[PDB]
Design a protein around this ligand. Structure first.
Ligand SMILES: Nc1nc(O)c2[nH]nnc2n1
Ligand SMILES: Nc1nc(O)c2[nH]nnc2n1
Ligand SMILES: [Zn+2]
Ligand SMILES: [Zn+2]
Lengths: 189, 189
């Protein structure tokens, strides 16, 4: 594009960002995200998906997936898209804006150093991860050089962190992605 | 969009991305980048700008500026837009892809933790900064929790790093923004 940075979304994702969806339980939220991982893999993307939910009600605000290769954009990680699309939807660059319900980013895998920073500047007050960093590195994806004890860095900034949620289900999807090739392989790898 | 990730670019930035331009000297490259910083401030954006140049020829590939507030996107840092717009233009998520010239990211200030990762994933082989992280955090801009010796971290990834280029002018622009960042109206601003 000439007058804008435009990252298009595939059909399943456009739908995911425009379909009403309230998922109370944390496992319900993560389960849905893993559904997005599968759909994204079939849509030429990396094995990564994430979604911003209102922390308490579980109302889905926005979802993103790895679109690095098909989108010719190394910054197009699931977290970046999810956080940015949620901000556009709520009409603010700051999800912690006064009067705004607390937001939570539910992600299929622990964040790379890039998305680590993205979470910090986003305004989200919670981060829930499925697959661990080691799980991701085991299929060729780099997390990059994150600071020492990144989880503590987030908590120290008001962002609670949960890991390992439905990890096994996520790994099955990571192992399947690796087994069946990949393509130019996403970013952070 | 209310579906795709869309960050609009202000006229001056479109202009910059539209007109072929070659800047051989580092000072020339940074000088142009600092011109974008001032233009961006005048266009309701943050005091930051960056541009991707072909390292060995000086050809400008793409430029970006902080459009966080106007863009309703916390991930819209100079570096992110510059790197992404360069990739969209060359039609690839890897700036070091076979066939492409070695790229260089010239930025008005040392990268925050988010952009730190973006640089690594981008494919650029060189990073050139003006203002130091202390100058930026001096006017209240957080760089975030970068890993220890992030500069060495980059060099170990094969990305050469230079900093302090035209630091004085960069710093003056930062202070200029700060002096005018308040609610009480000042005709001189
Ligand atoms: N580490 C890593 N790599 C990718 O390519 C990703 N896409 N989305 N999240 C991602 N995380
Ligand atoms: N630290 C920091 N803060 C911002 O707002 C930026 N925009 N672009 N680069 C930026 N870097
Ligand atoms: Zn990431
Ligand atoms: Zn940044």
């Amino acid at each position: 594009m000439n007058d804008a940075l435009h990252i298009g979304l595939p059909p399943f994702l456009v739908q995911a960002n425009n379909e009403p969806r309230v998922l109370a339980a944390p496992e319900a939220r993560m389960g849905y995200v893993l559904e997005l991982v599968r759909a994204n893999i079939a849509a030429d993307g990396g094995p990564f998906a994430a979604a911003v939910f209102e922390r308490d009600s579980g109302l889905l605000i926005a979802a993103g997936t790895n679109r690095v290769v098909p989108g010719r954009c190394s910054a197009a990680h699931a977290e970046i898209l999810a956080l940015s699309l949620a901000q556009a939807k709520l009409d603010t660059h700051d999800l912690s804006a006064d009067g705004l319900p607390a937001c939570e980013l539910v992600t299929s895998a622990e964040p790379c150093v890039m998305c680590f920073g993205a979470v910090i500047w986003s305004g989200v007050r919670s981060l829930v991860c499925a697959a661990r960093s080691d799980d991701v590195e085991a299929i060729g994806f780099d997390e990059g050089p994150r600071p020492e004890n990144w989880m503590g860095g987030l908590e120290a900034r008001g962002i609670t962190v949960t890991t390992g949620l439905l990890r096994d289900a996520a790994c099955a999807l990571l192992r399947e992605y690796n087994a069946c090739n990949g393509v130019i392989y996403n970013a952070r790898c």
